[PDB]
Design a binder for these strands. Structure first.
Lengths: 257, 58, 107, 95, 110, 57, 690
RNA sequence: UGCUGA
DNA sequence: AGGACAGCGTGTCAGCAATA
DNA sequence: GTACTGTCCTCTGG
């Protein structure tokens, strides 16, 4: 899936877009990590996060937000997965630690890193009888699908500088995901008329069916264009009018009959 | 330049593309760059890559 | 015996899970030693420094392009693929420079 | 009760050798004595090394003569690895 | 590099053999409390049986048995040969003897 | 093909037999030079990798 | 050699020679070496392999009345074709010239001598006539063997024929070399459809294809489960059975859990997920009830007794041995060797799972071998002999269960009552091509096994004895990756000679210099030589750390752990022996040494194959100039120049015999194939056969 | 079911 | 109501042998 | 082969 919104051609918009591109790319716990150190029924875990030199440049992240993420989402999804396994097996440092263990009954105390996330570990223990194995497997299969924050549906943006020779000045913010409403907030940075997507079900849900007809036609035309073939527009018009006849984008297949 | 799947000919499991070539050989010849022509025929290794391509076509 | 701890060091087999009382309770030759060993096992481990890292990773396609026009002029670029049978000839894939318009001839 | 090994009827216990004072525990525990384990191919003839200087460290090729034919044997010497075969010796202390 | 002069004093008739033991479950923490008994086959007329031997080790808790015949006899006793070298550090002379290796294992009967 | 035109073709084919190291190296973003065996190892790693998108590069 | 006296430029003064029509004294010898793999395989299958096949053949004991009867087959013998009974006259022999005139099968008589006993003190040796088995043409059980071209013309034969085929109803079926995975070698595979085999299975596993003396094949898969545990899948009679490892390891060896564990952690004695997962395999399912070898054999016996169809009076411990003998590691006689082989295949799944090793492509010829006409023939013969025993004693048990004392009067009238079987079953596999077997013979294909050999031309005919079919099932596949012409089939398969439609990439042909191995040797003094060379036996004292050591294998049997700084010299010494024909190293042993680095390269170790179905090809061994033979897997770790002046000092270990060695026999008949485009030259190969 | 032709 | 999953699907074009 | 429909399957809402 993809998108392509032109950039509005104003000096302020060009400056804001850099931040916009850096704002919609997904940053995942796994993309920001050096290596874990698991000790094992008392299972400790130190994350040892990366320095900002080589990941803050194009990800727009800060260490307090990243660490706060572990306290509220990763360190409880960890107990969620531990239960997933164990159900079928047979002055200020203080408030943060306290609220965090207010909510869970297993953790004991983590750490603090007053100097750029120096050493940030945690400790757990299930004292009676649990399957003591290399649980690093779980806390590694989980530290990959754990994403700090991302716009739903968008996996990465990119500004393909030039798209025109006639009015070469055009800039395009292409994307490799699809979320139409999460771009409506930038009607001053980007041109939301001229927004395009190859989805045809998302266009049909944000703009209607008469707007999905033309996306269908343009998609078929651009599919044939990569080979030099050129079907006459009068044929794609009829195909798109038949497909979208009864208000919905209906497939041309066994369930359409 | 021979291209099979949009990529150069595949390597073996040991890192050589053909029994004649050292493993992980940098020369473009080892990756399917045929500098021979049908006027003066192509050597055996180039013959091999050309056959790979002509067969994937079918 | 002067050996690994998960088994019945002096005797034959492997012990059972070290849970409760002495060993606890093996099947053959139950002979019991060290209700609990001294040090809980220290397993020092680490993870990969290639994939997850953005540290320690700081340091260590136009074709041959012959001349034919479609929209403008002055030099396309071609990839040859034999997308045909053994009784036919090789198809050619051209691409422009000023723009990016792909051709896909038959020969 | 330990089921005590029971010797099959066709076997008899071999007495110690009181005519063996060489492999005696006393002889082997002498301050000037070192024990070495040697592993060789099944067809190895140890006499082919008689008088020759076998290495006590590293790797060396040693030449031997067997039945008129020259053989060369690569000899590897190492530090005992935990779990190696233990030599048994007769002991007066053990009855 | 340190070297030793090799001598095979060995066995007078080759009837004489030393005895090496290896335990399948690791190292014995206290080999000093073990009593080893070597058993030989009474049949000295059958060349096949005359070299059959059993080594038994008894502890307070368990018994170990090794044999040079049958499944318990392992390949290393033949494909390779084992020797024991006795090195005199003072003379630099190594006396070499034939050795027999026994793989020891635990004793239980139904 | 004319002679005196196949000589240029032959010299260009001779020149083309020296363009592998630079190509691969400058695609692995390796130190610009001084590595002649780190490049083979990096190529091998990229080849036995799981993702296999640093190999297509 | 065997490629000398190859003409340097063609001549035309052989036609127009005063001796053009005079039949020659001996046959051509270059045409003979084309069907040589089809004939030398059958020669073993019918004389030396048949005795071994019948030797396995467990004695078929069963219950009659209140009696237990044992029937064993002491020998089976196939006789050359001959006039049926003596009812005919003037010539006992029967030459293939007829059965082409008439439309009949060239079939020889298969007869065995069974030996039936009642408790082992009452016995009599009867000689039953099993049936008729088809015969190849110049196969040592045929009447045209040892005939010069002049005597081959008075019988109506081609004077230049190399048979290598069967005449089933006068149609000359040409059973062709199918491709099998490999034999007696563990191939580590990453197949994602494996996790559907159970609740916690992963997409990792080492498969092994085991063949014993060319009469039996079996496929066993060791699967990795997410817990760190390994399972074993075996197939008996087309049913898949899953046994946790540990049940298998404890049964095979009367060893403690400590030496066993110490074996599966040999090279990774610092890893702790492994050390913990090995203990879970030994304790979780085996300290749960069975801790002595017999109790494990007893438990395994009770669960599997129903589907192994064992005798009712068999102890459960005896039914377990039946499973291990007939389903896991057929190739190895010992149970101690079967343990060490299951342990190296596991040590390998742990390395594939931890990404320390590269999956072996099953579609590279490195990990492939061929199925010859003799392997299919014996593997069907043995199965049909077992079926004959079973049927005769079905009839036995079913007739009367009556006082066998006087029933020793009709014992032969009983055995003959079911000896009426073995003939028609055999002709179906040859006349139709498809296989009807209780066990598919460890094959994976049940059709297209034999095909019609048509003499439209002599270039259509000669290409039936050099064809190699990847498989008949791959003709139905969305993905096209078994049709890729990888660079590992250099010198073993022709790039150009492939059908150019639906069979493309699936039906290949051998190059002119390539050849199938078919000889069988002793290979008993090899394990004792490897130890002289520097190997240390599996038993112990490696002299290093089990991680700086190479695991040595020789035909499924792990000799064990040549040191890491002695592996190169050992491989070079072994290669010099095979080249100069010293020791007893077969001229065709493949000494492979897959080096080990820190990279995820193919699993390290020194293999040494000498089995009878691998492809080999000649290459001029430089530094000796002695015409070595290299194999598909041994060719990936060596440089082989083509033209001289391409040979260098350190590089170019070997050199190829002729520059056109890469091309097939037919592709060598196309003139100037170098100046035509490749889809054309491949087309020439399909048009020269029509 | 093995082949073959566009 | 978040799923888990079992369940249908198609697949250019004509000949010959031969045999169910 | 993958992706669809389908099919419940039964988990928190009045």
């Amino acid at each position: 899936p993809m998108m392509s919104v032109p950039v509005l051609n104003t000096k302020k918009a060009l400056k804001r877009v850099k931040s916009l591109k850096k704002q919609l790319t997904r940053v995942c716990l796994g993309e920001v990590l050096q290596k874990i150190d698991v000790q094992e029924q008392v299972y400790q875990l130190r994350f040892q996060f990366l320095p900002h030199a080589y990941y803050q440049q194009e990800k727009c992240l800060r260490p307090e937000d990243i660490l706060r993420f572990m306290e509220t989402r990763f360190f409880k999804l960890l107990m969620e997965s531990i239960k997933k396994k164990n159900n079928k097996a047979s002055e200020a440092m203080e408030r943060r630690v306290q609220a965090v263990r207010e909510i869970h009954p297993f953790i004991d105390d983590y750490q603090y890193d007053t100097e750029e996330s120096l050493w940030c570990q945690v400790t757990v223990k299930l004292p009676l009888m649990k399957i003591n194995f290399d649980m690093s497997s779980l806390v590694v299969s989980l530290a990959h699908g754990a994403v700090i924050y991302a716009t739903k549906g968008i996996t990465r943006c990119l500004l393909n500088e030039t798209t025109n020779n006639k009015n070469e000045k055009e800039l395009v913010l292409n994307t490799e995901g699809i979320n139409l409403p999460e771009l409506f907030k930038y009607a001053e940075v980007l041109d939301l008329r001229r927004l395009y997507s190859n989805d045809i079900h998302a266009i049909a849900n944000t703009y209607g069916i008469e707007a999905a007809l033309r996306v269908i036609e343009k998609e078929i035309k651009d599919v044939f264009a990569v080979y030099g073939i050129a079907v006459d527009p009068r044929h794609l018009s009829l195909v798109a009018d038949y497909m979208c006849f009864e208000g919905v984008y209906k497939p041309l297949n066994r369930f359409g009959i | 330049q021979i291209e099979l799947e949009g990529r150069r000919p595949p390597l073996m499991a040991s890192g050589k593309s053909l029994p004649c070539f050292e493993p992980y050989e940098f020369t473009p010849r080892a990756g399917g760059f045929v500098t021979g022509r049908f006027l003066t025929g192509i050597k055996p290794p180039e013959f091999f890559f050309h056959c790979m391509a002509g067969r994937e076509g079918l | 015996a002067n050996t690994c701890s998960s088994f019945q060091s002096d005797l034959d087999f492997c012990s059972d899970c070290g849970s409760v009382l002495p060993l606890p309770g093996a099947q053959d030759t139950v002979t019991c030693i060290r209700c609990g060993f001294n040090i809980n096992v220290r397993d020092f481990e680490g993870k990969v420094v290639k994939t997850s890292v953005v540290f320690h990773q700081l340091g260590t396609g136009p074709v041959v392009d012959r001349r034919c026009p479609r929209c403008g002029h002055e030099g396309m670029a071609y990839h040859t693929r034999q997308m045909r049978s053994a009784d036919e000839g090789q198809t050619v894939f051209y691409t422009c420079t000023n723009c990016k318009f792909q051709e896909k001839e038959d020969s | 009760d330990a089921a005590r090994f029971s010797c099959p009827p066709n076997f008899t216990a071999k007495p110690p050798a009181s005519e063996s004072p060489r492999f005696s525990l006393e002889a082997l525990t002498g301050p000037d004595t070192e024990l070495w384990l040697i592993q060789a191919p099944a067809d190895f003839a140890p006499e082919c090394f008689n008088g020759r200087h076998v290495p006590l460290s590293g790797s060396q090729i040693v030449k031997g003569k067997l039945a008129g034919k020259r053989h060369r044997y690569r000899v590897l010497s190492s530090c005992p690895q935990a779990g190696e075969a233990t030599l048994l010796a007769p002991s007066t202390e053990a009855g | 590099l340190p070297s030793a002069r090799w001598q095979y004093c060995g066995a007078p008739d080759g009837s004489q053999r030393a005895v090496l033991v290896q335990f399948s479950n690791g190292k014995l923490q206290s080999p000093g409390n073990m009593r080893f008994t070597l058993y030989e086959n009474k049949d000295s007329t059958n060349p096949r049986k005359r070299n059959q031997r059993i080594l038994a080790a008894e502890t307070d808790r368990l018994s170990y048995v090794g044999n040079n015949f049958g499944t318990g006899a392992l390949k290393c006793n033949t494909l390779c040969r084992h020797f024991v070298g006795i090195l005199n550090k003072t003379s630099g002379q190594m006396e070499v003897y034939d050795a027999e290796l026994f793989n020891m294992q635990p004793l239980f009967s139904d | 093909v004319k002679p005196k035109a196949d000589v240029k073709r032959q010299r260009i084919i001779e020149e083309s037999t020296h363009c592998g190291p630079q190509a691969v190296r400058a695609a692995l973003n390796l130190p610009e030079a001084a590595s002649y065996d780190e490049v083979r190892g990096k190529w091998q790693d990229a080849h036995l990798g799981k993702d296999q998108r640093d190999f297509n590069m | 050699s065997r490629w000398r006296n190859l003409p340097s430029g063609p001549s035309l003064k052989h036609l127009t020679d005063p001796s053009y029509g005079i039949p020659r004294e001996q046959q051509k010898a270059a045409l003979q070496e084309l069907t040589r793999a089809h004939v030398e395989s059958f020669n073993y299958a019918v004389h030396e392999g048949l005795g071994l096949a019948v030797q396995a053949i467990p004695p078929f004991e069963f219950a009659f009345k209140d009696e237990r009867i044992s029937f064993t087959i002491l020998d089976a013998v196939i006789s050359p074709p001959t006039v049926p009974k003596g009812t005919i006259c003037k010539e006992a022999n029967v030459y293939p010239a007829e059965c082409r005139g008439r439309r009949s099968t060239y079939r020889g008589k298969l007869t065995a001598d069974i030996n039936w006993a009642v408790n082992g003190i009452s016995k009599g040796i009867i000689k039953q006539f099993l049936g008729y088995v088809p015969i190849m043409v110049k196969s040592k059980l045929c009447n045209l063997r040892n005939l010069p071209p002049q005597a081959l013309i008075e019988h109506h034969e081609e004077a230049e024929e190399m048979g290598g085929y069967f005449i089933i109803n006068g149609i000359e079926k040409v059973i062709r070399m199918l491709i099998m995975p490999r034999r007696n070698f563990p191939i580590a595979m990453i197949r994602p459809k494996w996790k559907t085999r159970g609740p916690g299975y992963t997409q990792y596993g080492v498969s092994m294809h085991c063949v014993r003396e060319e009469h039996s094949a079996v496929n066993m898969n060791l699967h990795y489960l997410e817990n760190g545990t390994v399972m074993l899948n075996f197939i008996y009679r087309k049913e898949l059975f899953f046994l946790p490892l540990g049940f298998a390891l404890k049964a095979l060896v009367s060893f403690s859990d400590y030496q066993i564990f110490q074996e599966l952690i040999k090279g990774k004695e610092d890893d702790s997920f492994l050390r913990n997962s090995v203990s879970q395999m030994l304790r979780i399912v085996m300290e749960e009830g069975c801790s002595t070898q017999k109790q494990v054999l007893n438990y395994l016996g009770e669960c599997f007794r129903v589907k192994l169809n064992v005798p009712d009076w068999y102890p459960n411990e005896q039914a377990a041995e039946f499973l291990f003998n007939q389903c896991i590691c057929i190739h190895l006689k010992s149970n101690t060797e079967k343990f060490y082989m299951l342990c190296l295949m596991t040590r390998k799944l742990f390395a594939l799972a931890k990404g320390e090793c590269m999956e072996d492509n099953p579609d590279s010829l490195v990990n492939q071998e061929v199925l010859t006409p003799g392997q299919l023939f014996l593997m069907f013969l043995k199965e049909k002999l077992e079926g004959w025993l079973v049927s005769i004693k079905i009839a036995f048990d079913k007739k009367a269960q009556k006082t066998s004392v006087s029933m020793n009067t009709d014992n032969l009238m009983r055995i003959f009552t079911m000896g009426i079987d073995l003939t028609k079953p055999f002709e179906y596999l040859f006349a139709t091509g498809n296989l009807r077997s209780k066990t598919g013979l460890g094959l994976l294909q049940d059709s297209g096994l034999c095909v019609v050999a048509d003499k439209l031309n002599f270039i259509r005919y000669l290409s039936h004895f050099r064809c190699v079919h990847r498989g008949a099932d791959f003709a139905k596949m969305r993905t096209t990756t078994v049709r890729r012409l990888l660079p590992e089939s250099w010198g073993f398969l022709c790039p150009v000679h492939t059908p150019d439609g639906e069979p493309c990439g699936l039906m290949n042909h051998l190059t002119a210099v390539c050849e199938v191995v078919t000889q069988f040797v002793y290979t008993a003094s090899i394990p004792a030589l490897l130890c002289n060379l520097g190997v240390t036996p599996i038993d112990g004292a490696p002299h290093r750390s089990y991680s700086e050591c190479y695991p040595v294998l020789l035909d499924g049997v792990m000799v064990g752990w040549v040191d890491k700084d002695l592996a190169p010299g050992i491989a070079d010494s072994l290669r010099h022996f095979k080249v100069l024909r010293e020791k007893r190293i077969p001229p065709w042993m493949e000494v492979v040494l897959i080096p080990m680095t820190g990279k995820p390269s193919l699993y390290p170790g020194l293999f040494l194959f000498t089995t009878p179905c691998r492809l080999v090809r000649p290459v001029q061994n430089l530094a000796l100039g002695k015409e070595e033979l290299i194999g598909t897997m041994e060719q990936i770790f060596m440089n082989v120049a083509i033209f001289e002046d391409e040979v260098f000092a350190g590089v170019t270990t070997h050199q190829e015999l002729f520059p056109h060695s890469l091309l097939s026999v037919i592709a060598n008949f196309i003139p100037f194939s170098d100046h035509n485009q490749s889809p054309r030259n491949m087309y020439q190969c399909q048009m020269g056969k029509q």
